[PDB]
Symmetry: C3
Subunit: 32 residues, 3 copies
């Protein structure tokens, strides 16, 4: 169970990094 969780967490980390970059680019495109 812990090994499987470790792999799920690593996958999530890669996706969240990404979303952060994508969100930062969209914020620039839309502007303020």
């Amino acid at each position: 169970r812990v090994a499987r969780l470790e792999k799920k967490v690593s996958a999530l980390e890669k996706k969240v990094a990404x979303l952060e970059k994508e969100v930062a680019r969209l914020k620039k495109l839309v502007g303020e």
Copy 2:
């Protein structure tokens, strides 16, 4: 401890799915 973590990771996987979908939609609307 591991069961509790599993629940948390499941909840995160759901939230990231979504964000991915929302971010794909916004990217299509902004273009580029």
Copy 3:
């Protein structure tokens, strides 16, 4: 190993919170 996972999961939760806020703002401006 479990404590290392717990730290990683806490970190992700704070990051997803956020992304949700930022995305909610973007959705409102573009919608």
